[PDB]
Amino acid sequence: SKVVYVSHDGTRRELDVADGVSLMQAAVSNGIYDIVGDCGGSASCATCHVYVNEAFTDKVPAANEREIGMLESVTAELKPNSRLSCQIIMTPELDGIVVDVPDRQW
Ligand code: FES
Protein backbone atom coordinates (compact mmCIF):
# COMPACT_ATOMS: atom_id res chain seq x y z
CA SER A 1 0.00 0.00 0.00
CA LYS A 2 1.11 3.58 -0.63
CA VAL A 3 2.54 5.90 2.01
CA VAL A 4 3.92 9.38 1.37
CA TYR A 5 6.62 10.99 3.51
CA VAL A 6 6.99 14.77 3.29
CA SER A 7 10.20 16.15 4.78
CA HIS A 8 10.71 19.51 6.48
CA ASP A 9 11.83 21.20 3.24
CA GLY A 10 8.80 19.78 1.43
CA THR A 11 10.62 16.97 -0.39
CA ARG A 12 8.27 14.06 -1.04
CA ARG A 13 9.11 10.35 -0.97
CA GLU A 14 6.52 7.69 -1.76
CA LEU A 15 6.86 4.08 -0.58
CA ASP A 16 4.93 0.83 -1.06
CA VAL A 17 4.38 -0.57 2.44
CA ALA A 18 3.16 -4.11 3.15
CA ASP A 19 0.46 -5.01 5.66
CA GLY A 20 1.67 -5.17 9.25
CA VAL A 21 4.72 -2.94 8.73
CA SER A 22 4.96 0.26 10.78
CA LEU A 23 5.54 3.60 9.08
CA MET A 24 8.78 3.85 11.07
CA GLN A 25 10.04 0.46 9.87
CA ALA A 26 9.26 1.38 6.26
CA ALA A 27 10.96 4.77 6.58
CA VAL A 28 14.23 3.64 8.16
CA SER A 29 14.50 0.70 5.76
CA ASN A 30 14.15 3.05 2.79
CA GLY A 31 16.60 5.80 3.65
CA ILE A 32 14.07 8.31 4.99
CA TYR A 33 16.57 9.48 7.59
CA ASP A 34 14.27 12.18 8.97
CA ILE A 35 12.81 9.31 11.01
CA VAL A 36 15.22 7.58 13.42
CA GLY A 37 13.57 4.81 15.45
CA ASP A 38 16.29 4.80 18.09
CA CYS A 39 14.42 2.43 20.43
CA GLY A 40 13.51 0.01 17.64
CA GLY A 41 9.77 0.63 17.52
CA SER A 42 8.65 -0.09 21.09
CA ALA A 43 7.48 3.49 21.72
CA SER A 44 10.25 4.49 24.15
CA CYS A 45 12.46 7.05 22.38
CA ALA A 46 10.14 9.35 20.42
CA THR A 47 12.72 9.63 17.63
CA CYS A 48 10.17 8.49 15.03
CA HIS A 49 7.94 11.52 15.56
CA VAL A 50 5.77 12.49 12.58
CA TYR A 51 2.80 14.77 11.91
CA VAL A 52 -0.06 12.70 10.50
CA ASN A 53 -1.95 14.35 7.63
CA GLU A 54 -5.45 15.63 8.52
CA ALA A 55 -7.14 13.37 5.97
CA PHE A 56 -5.94 10.38 8.01
CA THR A 57 -5.71 11.59 11.62
CA ASP A 58 -9.33 10.36 11.68
CA LYS A 59 -8.66 7.07 9.86
CA VAL A 60 -5.62 5.70 11.71
CA PRO A 61 -6.12 4.05 15.14
CA ALA A 62 -6.03 6.50 18.05
CA ALA A 63 -2.81 6.73 20.07
CA ASN A 64 -2.38 4.29 22.95
CA GLU A 65 -1.43 5.19 26.54
CA ARG A 66 2.22 4.26 26.08
CA GLU A 67 2.49 6.41 22.94
CA ILE A 68 0.74 9.33 24.61
CA GLY A 69 3.31 9.18 27.40
CA MET A 70 6.33 8.82 25.13
CA LEU A 71 5.17 11.64 22.84
CA GLU A 72 6.06 14.21 25.50
CA SER A 73 9.74 13.43 24.91
CA VAL A 74 9.75 14.55 21.27
CA THR A 75 12.29 17.33 20.72
CA ALA A 76 10.37 18.75 17.77
CA GLU A 77 7.18 20.76 18.20
CA LEU A 78 4.40 18.60 19.61
CA LYS A 79 1.13 19.07 17.73
CA PRO A 80 -2.42 17.69 17.95
CA ASN A 81 -1.56 15.38 15.06
CA SER A 82 1.86 14.37 16.39
CA ARG A 83 2.24 10.60 16.36
CA LEU A 84 5.03 8.07 16.73
CA SER A 85 5.44 6.53 13.29
CA CYS A 86 6.33 3.22 14.93
CA GLN A 87 2.75 3.04 16.25
CA ILE A 88 1.05 3.41 12.86
CA ILE A 89 0.67 -0.06 11.32
CA MET A 90 0.04 -0.23 7.58
CA THR A 91 -3.06 -1.91 6.14
CA PRO A 92 -4.83 -1.57 2.77
CA GLU A 93 -7.25 0.85 4.43
CA LEU A 94 -4.42 3.35 5.03
CA ASP A 95 -3.35 3.44 1.38
CA GLY A 96 -2.41 6.97 0.35
CA ILE A 97 -1.67 8.20 3.87
CA VAL A 98 0.67 11.19 4.12
CA VAL A 99 2.86 12.17 7.06
CA ASP A 100 5.29 15.05 7.52
CA VAL A 101 8.61 14.49 9.26
CA PRO A 102 9.56 17.13 11.90
CA ASP A 103 12.50 19.53 11.50
CA ARG A 104 14.31 17.33 14.00
CA GLN A 105 13.92 14.22 16.16
CA TRP A 106 16.50 15.19 18.76
S1 FES B 1 10.94 4.08 17.19
FE1 FES B 1 11.23 4.67 19.34
S2 FES B 1 9.38 5.65 19.95
FE2 FES B 1 8.99 5.10 17.80
Curated annotation (Swiss-Prot):
One Gene Ontology biological process: P450-containing electron transport chain
This protein's UniProt keywords: 2Fe-2S, Electron transport, Iron, Iron-sulfur, Metal-binding, Transport
Residues reported to bind [2Fe-2S] cluster: 39, 45, 48, 86
Record-linked SUPFAM superfamilies: 2Fe-2S ferredoxin-like (SSF54292)
Gene Ontology CC annotations of this record: cytosol
Domain (2Fe-2S ferredoxin-type) ranges: 1-105
Highest taxon of source: Bacteria
Ribonucleoprotein recorded as keyword: no
Cofactor note: Binds 1 [2Fe-2S] cluster.
Self-association and partners: Monomer.
Protein purpose: The oxidation of camphor by cytochrome P450-CAM requires the participation of a flavoprotein, putidaredoxin reductase, and an iron-sulfur protein, putidaredoxin, to mediate the transfer of electrons from NADH to P450 for oxygen activation.
Family: Belongs to the adrenodoxin/putidaredoxin family.
Protein name, as recorded: Putidaredoxin
Record organism: Pseudomonas putida (Arthrobacter siderocapsulatus)
Gene: camB
